[PDB]
Amino acid sequence: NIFKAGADEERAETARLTSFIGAIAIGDLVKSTLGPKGMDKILLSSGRDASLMVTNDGATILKNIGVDNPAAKVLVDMSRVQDDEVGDGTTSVTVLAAELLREAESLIAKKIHPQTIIAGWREATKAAREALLSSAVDHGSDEVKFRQDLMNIAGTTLSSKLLTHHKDHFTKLAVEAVLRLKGSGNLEAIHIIKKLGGSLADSYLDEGFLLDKKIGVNQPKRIENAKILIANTGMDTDKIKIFGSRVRVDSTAKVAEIEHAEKEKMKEKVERILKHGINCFINRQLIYNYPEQLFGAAGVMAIEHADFAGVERLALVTGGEIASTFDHPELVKLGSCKLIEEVMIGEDKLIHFSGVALGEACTIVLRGATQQILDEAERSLHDALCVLAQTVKDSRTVYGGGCSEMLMAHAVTQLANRTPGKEAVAMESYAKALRMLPTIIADNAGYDSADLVAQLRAAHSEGNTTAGLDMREGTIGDMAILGITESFQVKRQVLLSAAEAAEVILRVDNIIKAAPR
Amino acid sequence: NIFKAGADEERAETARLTSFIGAIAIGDLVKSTLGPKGMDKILLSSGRDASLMVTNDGATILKNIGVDNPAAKVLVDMSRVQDDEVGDGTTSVTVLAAELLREAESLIAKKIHPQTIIAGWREATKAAREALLSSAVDHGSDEVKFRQDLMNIAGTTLSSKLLTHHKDHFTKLAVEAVLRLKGSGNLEAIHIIKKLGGSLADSYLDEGFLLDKKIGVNQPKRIENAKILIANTGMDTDKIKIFGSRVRVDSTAKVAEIEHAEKEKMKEKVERILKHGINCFINRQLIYNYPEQLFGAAGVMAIEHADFAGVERLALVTGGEIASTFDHPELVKLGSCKLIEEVMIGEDKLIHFSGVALGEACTIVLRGATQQILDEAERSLHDALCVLAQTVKDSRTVYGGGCSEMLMAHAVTQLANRTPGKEAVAMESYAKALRMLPTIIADNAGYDSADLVAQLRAAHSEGNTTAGLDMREGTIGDMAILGITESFQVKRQVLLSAAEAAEVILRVDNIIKAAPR
Amino acid sequence: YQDRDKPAQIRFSNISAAKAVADAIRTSLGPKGMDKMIQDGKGDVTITNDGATILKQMQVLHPAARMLVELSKAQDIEAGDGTTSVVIIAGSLLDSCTKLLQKGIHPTIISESFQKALEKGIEILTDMSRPVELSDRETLLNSATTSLNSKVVSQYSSLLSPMSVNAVMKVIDPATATSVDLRDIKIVKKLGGTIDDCELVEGLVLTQKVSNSGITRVEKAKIGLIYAQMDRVLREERAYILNLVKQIKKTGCNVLLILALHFLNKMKIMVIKDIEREDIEFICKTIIDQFTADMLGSAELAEEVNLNGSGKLLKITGCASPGKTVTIVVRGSNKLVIEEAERSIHDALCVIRCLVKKRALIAGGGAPEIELALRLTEYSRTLSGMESYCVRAFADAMEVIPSTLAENAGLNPISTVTELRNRHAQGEKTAGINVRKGGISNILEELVVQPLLVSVSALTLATETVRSILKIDDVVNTR
Amino acid sequence: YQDRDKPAQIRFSNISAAKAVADAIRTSLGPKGMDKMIQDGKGDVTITNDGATILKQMQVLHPAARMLVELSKAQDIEAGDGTTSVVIIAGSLLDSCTKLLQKGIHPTIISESFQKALEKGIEILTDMSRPVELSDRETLLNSATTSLNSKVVSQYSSLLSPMSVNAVMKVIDPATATSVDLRDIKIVKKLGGTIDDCELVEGLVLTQKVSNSGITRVEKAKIGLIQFCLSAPKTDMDNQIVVSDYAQMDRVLREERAYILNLVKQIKKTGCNVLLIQKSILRDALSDLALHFLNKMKIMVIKDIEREDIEFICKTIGTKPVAHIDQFTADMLGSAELAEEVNLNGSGKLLKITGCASPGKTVTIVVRGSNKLVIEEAERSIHDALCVIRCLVKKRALIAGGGAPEIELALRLTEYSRTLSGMESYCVRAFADAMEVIPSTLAENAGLNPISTVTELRNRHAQGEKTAGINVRKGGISNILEELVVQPLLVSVSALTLATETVRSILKIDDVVNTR
């Protein structure tokens, strides 16, 4: 009667199996989506048939699925950090961390203590990390070679996505957006527009930070030296975000008094705005027509219906300030914009800037038939902009497609030659898990994995550090000639995060579950 | 009703298990006996309670146990040839062959075709033989170093036996008997004597071909220049091995007539033996006292009860002939002998010879408490003398005790990188089976096999080709300093006989059984 | 082998569930197809041979089999014909993949192989088609009349065919525009009269009555879409209603698309209310604080014409706005008379719409499928690798369409498709099965043809569905 | 873990089967040990406390249980005492090895550890032992009397002690031969008289008679062993005797008397006055017609002699076996100074042959008694006395009894276990703690507390000497030497050596395999 009524604790034997089986089941679920040939999957919620959909994205599958196992919950949380921070390698972290635990389970049946296995993986991690550093090749000069590497990385990130067919036109969009940046890797500077109509190949690009939103009814199409000032407050009517307050109206004249009181309150607000000496005004709330005419009479461009992402982006692109309180004049910094012009793309009024302070920003305008296509187009494009911005900070690049994963497995094998007794077997299973990534890629492509993977071992054994898998022709060739490469920061992050995730599972020999409420 | 009336056939996957499990069950049986620390085993025959015994010899266990599956009959027959032809490594062949099939069974579940595995083991076999040639060190000079290595062969062959106590004394007896040979490996020139009384350290060595059994009752201790003549017939009584024959006796006068004529028929044979004018006589049958006195009166020694093993050895040593018909002189060839002595060892009369042809012959006398010790000491000595015969023919020697097995496994691992994809996995399983031999030796000694085997792999990886296991101190040390070595012809035969035995079982995918007769 | 993990179990579950749907509807193919009896859960029993109607009443709970249901709906949106044929073709393809997966061929190799056979299949049907002129109204009349003869009403097809041709040629520039919007043509059916009476209106005709407003006529209209105190409130309610009317009066809107009945009559505003959103979209393309004059349409003369058999209709002509739209008025004795009259118009407009996008004509009666299966067999011999058996399986799966028409015609299904294959080898696609005479005959002389878009969209949409099903590894139930 | 092959199930089966044998027999240890009821399959029952007799009636089919039966038999051949003590020690060691096997220690390490403890165990018993002189017959007499006091007959152990001592001193050189062969001493027991009368005969004594020969006494007799049956002509080969009429009846009758007479004349020519014929169950050994002919030659006739006496007669008076009358001659004959039949009051008719006057060492003890059961227990008393004397000859020493050496052994091995390192610390300690089962059993049968008595002895042996122990007669802890309880050293040394070899043999058995 140690634990009853909802309280369950698995013993050292059962909590051992439960920890791995729960974690391995997560890795075996999304392993079919690895590679450009990866399989699709159907997600359907219980009780609701409107959740039907098909996606090959490994990150989307892990977010919607629930996890009742605390051991598998740690692996899921480490996958979401990979997608939110770096943006690439979400599937690679889950698969590699699962293969380490699958091989670690077989070592425990050999009566190898878990602490000994951990001591082996720590030494093998440093040896595998130095292998990428020696093979990393960056470019200080020759921006043509640097731009070509960006196209290869962008085309690699867009693989196994909805945009994989049209990615050839999209590589020019993503690279040019990052190439024009030439600076800090802030992604708020590059706006994303989603418009209905047209195919995927009709997506345009604008280097003047084009806005996705339309302003006012009748607005001037051109303005010279417009000062950007952002404000946050209701510009429409009274009772903004106020619930429970009513107004007693006994007749029509009382409504006219409210209309006069509204114009009186808006007039006092327009006066405080004009005291700043600004040629342009921005607010998140919609602007009513009466204060719009007060802005148009003074030449102030009225911008309305701004979102939370707008205030943050409009401040850095134009060099302005949030300035939630416009009450006290000339205490806030004003933006700098040379020209604000109206551009119509997709049968919609859009706002185009010019000559803004730090004008290295830009905007990509997506074109699709429906919203579900545009949403998946933005998620695939945003994940590409994350690794391209990271490539500007660190220009070191390595060859992907089984080239880097097999090279690290070779350095660990040579380390197993000089080592004590028990750490030799532990590092061998660590090298086998690194060879499982190019093996799963060949299985999803229908090619023979045992033939292709084993030839890579003999290829990287004597020279030939650039060999890899070619999915197009189904053979082995140079990864430098075929143009397949990925960033260095992605490989180092996936390698360390997978090692730290599998290390926590080994350190837990028992799972104590209390009584649920 | 396709298969009935006793004739059955097993399907593909079923005969795959039937062939492998039948061979592995034989392998797992003798693994406990491998090594000097090998565990004992009990053998009890059905219906006979007096058959209860215990032995650690792997060769004896396989001979007494019947075999059912035909697949296991091939593995047992290959182990029997290893014991008769060589005499050492009978257990090493069965255990190594079982490890090859145990690893091959896991390769079939990986969809590796059996013909591909066979092609991998053949190429790995050549690399295993070339690694022994470089490691083998022979002696062209310094016979003292050659004789010192012969004592190391006796210590290894006599290990894991009942003679371990006094084994240090038996190392000199085995080497001295072989050094007197200087000829072909036929062991019929070296007689073996089993007598009770005394201890094992009291075992002597005679170079004058001391016989097994006594002769007559009252015999001369020494005779000068005795002529050896072998003959096969009864000299004791009439009607030897004759059933159904009778002699009619009418009265008491004929009762003694058949009794006196019985001595007359023997005396008539004595007169025909002396027609050659020899000094000594040898018979397969016994000798009655009356013809024994006729032999001693004329100066002829009476030798009786010479078995089939004796008459064939006495022919080559004395240089005589079987001479089945003594009826007429100069119809057969006689022998030559100088001195025939009598030495009492272990409460029995032993017949010593001196001044005979083929002086290279000798005899080893065994002394023990019970017949069970003498029987085990005979097979231990017979196997030791046969292995030393190959060391004289081929002086090349290798270091045993886990040293030679790891060197061959290191060459196969290096070849696995120079071989294409499908043949790479098959070679790794072949090299893994070679590492199983030192692993089982450490397990039977109560030590940790995980540490010792892993350190040897790291030791033989860079330099130190002489490293091996020390069972006495329980650690790793130099085999050249500790004086542990094995013959090259033995290790080469165990390596080839194990690969050919596992090749036949792996090639057979189906078993066709007929009706028992 | 081992195959401990068996993901193919869900693959076989998806093929079995999808084939069960195609096997049911197969017997309903062709004019001679057997009728089916569907019993509603309330106990009502109905009998119909239409495949598109039965698939909606099946209530399919299986996810993979619902894709075939949605596949039939996508076929009616584009081409509008051949709903049953698409489900049968998609069912035979998945059945042929069962023999391929047992041989160990990977689905992605199978999926990529069907795409090469699909690109080659389009060229085969295109080269053997018959180019026709869109500006010619004699071919449009004959192609629609012979097509509607196999439909429910074969007697009145001669009347409704030119009404659809003159409507499309009015709203679409002949031999110029490649896109036709079927929503630009509205069909109005009313009880009374006969089908012999039809009126093609260049403007818009609605079902609403202007009651109780008695203006009934507005010329040059701009149309747009949008105890003392007890008596004083009645005066204030008239003030609030008139207030919103004053803002409308300043813009000049004389017709509004929806006590106030009298205020709208003083301003001479015709009352149009109770309008369906789908009906507004027809008016949207044809012609309160956010209400302005820029969003107003235009019209010449509005009025309500009440006839004997057409009921109360709103006749508005001379919209004078950018666009091309017409309207068809349908009369008939009973409701079933006007129901099948309009259904024959939709089938007539879809066939004409197929001829505008793709100008061509191909023979019917299983002819396109046999000629397709004949050339892909020779095309599979030139290919190398796994694509050899994958294309042959795609070709042999096209034999289900002709074998089904021969089975419903009483002939021998095995002997019919065998004799026709050699007729297409020596001859052309003109050979085929004639269901009217019950035997093998030249379809070109039988005047049985179908537009090219029906056969092309059938292979294009079905292949994308088959490839989508094969790429599914498994299904995961979330919450 | 996994353990595809499980040898432990055979190890646990061997330990459980071996411990079950020692658990039953342990209650019979000591003079106060409880009795048992043994019911044979036929329904017969009996009551005996002897451990050796119970083990023969166990009929154990398990292999490990059979080796313990052979272990108890090897102890009676060497020392002849302590049969139950060896079985209990062999059962207590395997029980302590169970706790070691659960810790993951391999038996080969356990087997090698017991050998080092056995080496120290012999040295401890040697230092504590009190050396005694074998030439002194005073202490040797009290050694056999004390050992036979715990046996069945405690009354006659006083007079039978010197009779066994004088028999050994004649056939064994004092302080010379390390080994003594008890097969040269034979016991002749007859009904009537008492055990107090004992006669040590330097020659041989038989229980047969001179029948039918009426000589009964011969001086300077010549003796020989004839294995050939003297009777009517009979041949191993197939023959027939044809009797038709009265003429052929006399023809066969006269030849039967002539063939026997021809064989008797061969004995008369050699001068053999005493004929010892071996008993043969195949054909008649001696007939009636031969009795008449052997009386005319005046030769002593003796028959019905077992083969066991034939081997004794050969070595004693120097005779030799003769399988055929033609081979019978003076070379096979022995001799003696006096050969006759001595008939006393109640000792029955005995054949006394003395004065062999040849090389050899032989003696024969003749003991009388009333009941046949009384003379048999007298044979066991003399046999047990010769075993105790034999122990002092091979090893000269004396140690206290009543579990005294078991406490000193278990106490000192604990200190040696502290000085060692590795697995030998727990293995030797388990070997020491298993030595306390012997004193714990003697205290249980004595009516004391088994747990409290062993605790007090460990303190008395730490401060004092081996004198402390358990006295079963007074029911309390007292001086063992003052209570006249002593055992020879060979019994305790052979108990540890033989039991260790059996325990090590059981631990080396991984699996049993049945052949055919």
Q: Which residue of B has its CA nearest to D327?
A: B289
Question: What element of type H or E holds B174?
Answer: helix B167-179
First to last CA, chain A: 19
Q: Which residue of A has its CA nearest to D2?
A: A109
Q: Is C289 on the interface with A (CB under 8 A)?
A: yes
**Spans of all domains in chain C:** 1-132+360-479, 133-199+326-359, 200-325
Rounded Cα distance, A513 and A511, in Å: 6
CB atoms inside a 10 Å sphere around CB B317: 22
Residues with Cβ within 8 Å of residue C365, at least 6 apart in sequence: C402, C405, C432, C433, C434, C435, C443, C446, C448
Residues of A with CB under 8 A from a CB of B: 110, 112, 417-422, 424-425, 450-455, 457-458, 461-462
Instruction: Considering only the beta carbons, identify the residue of D106, D233, D512 that sits closest to B42.
Output: D512
Cβ contact, residue pair A45, C475, below 8 Å: no
Closest CA to B226 of B154, B166, B130, B314: B314
Residue owning tokens 């190799």: C109
Question: What element of type H or E holds B61?
Answer: helix B58-64
Instruction: Considering only the beta carbons, identify the residue of B417, B454, B458 that sits closest to A457.
Output: B417
Ramachandran sector of residue D402 (left: φ over 0; alpha: ψ -120 to 50; beta: rest)? left
Distance from CA of A427 to the nearest CA of B (A): 12
CB atoms inside a 10 Å sphere around CB A504: 14
- Give the distance, in angstroms, between the CA of residue B160 and the centroid of all CA atoms in the same chain: 15
Q: Are A171 and A155 in contact (CB under 8 A)?
A: yes
Rounded Cα distance, B288 and A198, in Å: 126
Listed in sequence order, the DSSP H helices in B274-370 are 289-297, 308-318
Rounded Cα distance, B189 and B364, in Å: 11
Joined tokens for residue D106: 């391999």
Joined tokens for residue D372: 């046949």
Q: Which residue of B has its CA nearest to C4?
A: B109
Distance from CA of D220 to the nearest CA of B (A): 29
A237 phi and psi angles, rounded to 5 deg: -145, -170
Joined tokens for residue D192: 């009537």
- For helices A421-434 and A90-108, the axis angle rounded to 10 degrees is 140
> Interior CA angle at C191 toward C187 and C197, to 5°?
65
Please report residues of A whose CB lies closer than 8 A to that of D1: 109, 111
- For helices A143-157 and A167-181, the axis angle rounded to 10 degrees is 130
Residues A353-377 as b/e (b if ≥16 CB within 10 A, e otherwise) read beebeebbbbbbbbbbeeeebbebb
Joined tokens for residue A230: 């952002």
Cβ contact, residue pair B249, D513, below 8 Å: no
Q: Are B101 and B23 in contact (CB under 8 A)?
A: yes
C327 phi and psi angles, rounded to 5 deg: -150, 140
Helix or strand or coil: residue B203?
A: coil
Which chains border A (3 or more CB–CB pairs < 8 Å)? B, C, D
- Written as one string, the DSSP assignment of C397-430 is GGGHHHHHHHHHTTS-HHHHHHHHHHHHHHS-TT
Q: What is the CA radius of gyration of chain D?
A: 29
Residues with Cβ within 8 Å of residue D53, at least 6 apart in sequence: none
Cβ contact, residue pair A446, C239, below 8 Å: no
Please report residues of D whose CB lies closer than 8 A to that of B43: 513, 515
Q: HEC states along A36-103? A: CCCCEEEEEECCCHHHCCECCCHHHHHHHCCCCCHHHHHHHHHHHHHHHCCCCCHHHHHHHHHHHHHH
Confirm whether residue C82 is marked as ligand binding: yes
Strand-pairing partners, residue A44, are: C477
Joined tokens for residue C313: 């209709």
Closest CA to D447 of D468, D413, D477, D478: D477
Question: What element of type H or E holds C374?
Answer: helix C367-382
Q: Are D36 and D48 in contact (CB under 8 A)?
A: yes
Residues with Cβ within 8 Å of residue D80, at least 6 apart in sequence: D383, D384, D387, D388, D390, D391
Instruction: Considering only the beta carbons, identify the residue of D105, D255, D509 that sits closest to B40.
Output: D509
Joined tokens for residue A77: 């949380």
Please report residues of D whose CB lies closer than 8 A to that of A111: 1
Joined tokens for residue C409: 């015609």
Instruction: Considering only the beta carbons, identify the residue of A420, A422, A450 that sits closest to B422.
Output: A450
| CATH numeric code, A206-393 | 3.50.7.10
Q: Are D173 and D179 in contact (CB under 8 A)?
A: no
Q: What is the CA radius of gyration of chain C?
A: 28
Q: β-strands B349-354, B53-55: how paired?
A: unpaired
B43 phi and psi angles, rounded to 5 deg: -125, 120
Rounded Cα distance, A213 and A210, in Å: 9
Q: β-strands A362-368, A204-206: how paired?
A: antiparallel
Rounded Cα distance, D107 and D509, in Å: 10
Cβ contact, residue pair A424, B454, below 8 Å: yes
Instruction: Considering only the beta carbons, identify the residue of C66, C243, C476 that sits closest to A43.
Output: C476
**Among C23, C27, C48, C50, the one annotated catalytic:** C50
Helix or strand or coil: residue B253?
A: helix
A185 phi and psi angles, rounded to 5 deg: -85, 20
Cβ contact, residue pair C474, A41, below 8 Å: yes
Q: Which residue of A has its CA nearest to C469?
A: A40
Confirm whether residue A168 is marked as ligand binding: no
Distances (CA, A) of A294 to A214, A323, A334: 19, 21, 20
Joined tokens for residue A29: 């679920």
Residue owning tokens 């035969």: B493
Segment 101-120 of chain C within 8 Å of chain A by CB: 106-109
Cβ contact, residue pair C239, A252, below 8 Å: yes
Strand-pairing partners, residue C223, are: C255
Q: Are A57 and A372 in contact (CB under 8 A)?
A: no
Cβ contact, residue pair D514, B39, below 8 Å: no
Burial of B194 (0-12, 13-18, 19+ CB in 10 A): middle
Which chains border B (3 or more CB–CB pairs < 8 Å)? A, C, D
Q: What one-letter code names the amino acid at B219?
A: Q
Joined tokens for residue A147: 């731009």
Rounded Cα distance, C127 and B459, in Å: 75
Q: What one-letter code names the amino acid at C288?
A: I
Residues D28-63 as b/e (b if ≥16 CB within 10 A, e otherwise) read bbbeebeebeeeeeeeeeeeebebbebbeeeebebb
- Written as one string, the DSSP assignment of C205-267 is EES---TT----EEES--EEE--HHHHHHHHHHHHHHHHHHHHHHHHT--EEE--HHHHHHHT
Q: Are A113 and A495 in contact (CB under 8 A)?
A: no
Q: What one-letter code names the amino acid at D481?
A: L
- Could you say which DSSP state residue B31 is in? G
Rounded Cα distance, C319 and C205, in Å: 12
Please report residues of B whose CB lies closer than 8 A to that of D261: none
Q: Which residue of B has its CA nearest to D510?
A: B41
Residue owning tokens 């018979």: B283
Which chains border D (3 or more CB–CB pairs < 8 Å)? A, B
Resolution stated for this PDB structure, in Å: 3.8
Q: What one-letter code names the amino acid at D399?
A: I
Joined tokens for residue D124: 């401890």
Residues D334-360 as b/e (b if ≥16 CB within 10 A, e otherwise) read bbbebbbbbeeeebeebbbbbbbeeee
Please report residues of B whose CB lies closer than 8 A to that of D233: 255
Q: Which of B17, B111, B113 to mutate to test the interface with C (most CBs of C within 10 A)?
A: B111
Residues with Cβ within 8 Å of residue C242, at least 6 apart in sequence: C263
Cβ contact, residue pair B66, D238, below 8 Å: no
Length of chain D equals: 516
Burial of B274 (0-12, 13-18, 19+ CB in 10 A): middle
Q: Are B89 and B411 in contact (CB under 8 A)?
A: no
Rounded Cα distance, A486 and A494, in Å: 12
Confirm whether residue C416 is marked as ligand binding: no
Rounded Cα distance, B487 and B466, in Å: 15
Instruction: Considering only the beta carbons, identify the residue of A418, A422, A453 that sits closest to B454.
Output: A422
Distances (CA, A) of B461 to A283, A414, A457, B454: 73, 10, 19, 11
- Give the distance, in angstroms, between the CA of residue D72 and the centroid of all CA atoms in the same chain: 12
- For helices D450-463 and D437-445, the axis angle rounded to 10 degrees is 120
Joined tokens for residue B13: 């996957």
Rounded Cα distance, B422 and A458, in Å: 12
Rounded Cα distance, D235 and B252, in Å: 13
Rounded Cα distance, D222 and D297, in Å: 14
Identify the sign of the CA torsion D96, D102, D104, D107.
positive
Q: Which residue of C has its CA nearest to A216?
A: C290
Rounded Cα distance, C117 and C376, in Å: 7
B40-45, strands of its sheet edge to edge:
B53-55, B40-45, D509-515
Distances (CA, A) of A315 to A224, A309, A331, A514, C300: 19, 10, 16, 49, 52
- Give the distance, in angstroms, between the CA of residue B265 and the centroid of all CA atoms in the same chain: 44
* Touch of C by A (3+ CB pairs closer than 8 Å): yes
Q: Which residue of D has its CA nearest to A109?
A: D1
Rounded Cα distance, C446 and C433, in Å: 10
Q: What is the CA radius of gyration of chain A?
A: 29
> Interior CA angle at C262 toward C257 and C268, to 5°?
60
> Interior CA angle at D284 toward D279 and D288, to 5°?
110
Strand-pairing partners, residue A287, are: A235
- Written as one string, the DSSP assignment of A152-175 is HHHHHHTTTSTTTTTHHHHHHHHH
Q: β-strands C472-478, A40-45: how paired?
A: parallel
Q: Are C319 and C205 in contact (CB under 8 A)?
A: no
Closest CA to A393 of A493, A485, A488: A488
Joined tokens for residue D273: 């006055």
Closest CA to D383 of D55, D174, D97, D81: D81
Q: HEC states along C185-205? A: EEEEEEEECCCCCEEEECCEE
Residue owning tokens 């709330």: A285
Cβ contact, residue pair B417, A450, below 8 Å: no
Distance from CA of A105 to the nearest CA of D (A): 12
Question: What element of type H or E holds B326?
Answer: none
Distance from CA of C110 to the nearest CA of B (A): 22
Distances (CA, A) of B314 to A261, B191, B304, D76: 142, 10, 13, 46
Confirm whether residue C427 is marked as ligand binding: no
A389 phi and psi angles, rounded to 5 deg: -70, -35
CB atoms inside a 10 Å sphere around CB B247: 12
Closest CA to B298 of B267, B274, B275, B276: B274
Helix or strand or coil: residue B223?
A: strand
Q: Are C95 and C9 in contact (CB under 8 A)?
A: no
Question: What element of type H or E holds C349?
Answer: helix C335-357
Helix or strand or coil: residue D310?
A: helix
Rounded Cα distance, A430 and A413, in Å: 9
Residue owning tokens 């097999």: A406
Q: Are C92 and C402 in contact (CB under 8 A)?
A: no
Confirm whether residue D500 is marked as ligand binding: no
Q: What one-letter code names the amino acid at A47?
A: G
| Interrupted backbone of chain A, residues before each interruption (C–N > 2.5 Å) | none
* Touch of B by A (3+ CB pairs closer than 8 Å): yes
Distance from CA of B45 to the nearest CA of D (A): 4
Q: Are A180 and A198 in contact (CB under 8 A)?
A: no
- Give the distance, in angstroms, between the CA of residue B344 and the centroid of all CA atoms in the same chain: 28
Rounded Cα distance, A157 and A162, in Å: 12
Burial of C234 (0-12, 13-18, 19+ CB in 10 A): exposed
Instruction: Considering only the beta carbons, identify the residue of B42, B54, B252 that sits closest to D255.
Output: B252
A190-196, strands of its sheet edge to edge:
A190-196, A362-368, A204-206
Please report residues of C whose CB lies closer than 8 A to that of A45: 477-479
C268 phi and psi angles, rounded to 5 deg: 60, 50
Identify the sign of the CA torsion C427, C429, C433, C437.
negative
Helix or strand or coil: residue B376?
A: helix
- Give the distance, in angstroms, between the CA of residue B282 and the centroid of all CA atoms in the same chain: 29
Our answer to whether residue C83 is catalytic in this structure is yes
Rounded Cα distance, C264 and C269, in Å: 5
Closest CA to C371 of C437, C426, C298: C426
Q: What one-letter code names the amino acid at B425?
A: V
Helix or strand or coil: residue B224?
A: strand
Our answer to whether residue C50 is catalytic in this structure is yes
Rounded Cα distance, D303 and D254, in Å: 25
Positions of D annotated as catalytic residues are 50, 83-84, 384
Question: What element of type H or E holds B191?
Answer: strand B190-196
B507 phi and psi angles, rounded to 5 deg: -75, -20
Distances (CA, A) of D58 to C422, D15, D19, D22: 95, 17, 14, 12
Cβ contact, residue pair A40, C468, below 8 Å: yes
Cis ω on the peptide bond leading into residue A283 (within 30° of 0)? no
